[PDB]
Write a protein that binds this ligand. Sequence first.
Ligand SMILES: *C(=O)CCCC[C@@H]1SC[C@@H]2NC(=O)N[C@@H]21
Length: 72
Amino acid sequence: TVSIQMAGNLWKVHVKAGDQIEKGQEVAILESMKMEIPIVADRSGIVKEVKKKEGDFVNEGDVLLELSNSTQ
Ligand SMILES: *C(=O)CCCC[C@@H]1SC[C@@H]2NC(=O)N[C@@H]21
């Protein structure tokens, strides 16, 4: 559902399975080879799963989130 958009490392994560999110809410942050990039919820919903965690490696198009309200 929500995915990373840049090569980097998932510096922080702010979501868990069962948590509520809203479009534009911060859900993770990239370090990106010493740059900083907020990762915000592409849509509102309840998180079904988080496909990554704090400090995991990530890339453009690499998954981040699955939601019980994207399933629609
Ligand atoms: C390079 O020196 C290794 C660590 C890089 C950490 C980066 S710098 C930009 C991001 N902000 C932060 O606090 N840590 C990330």
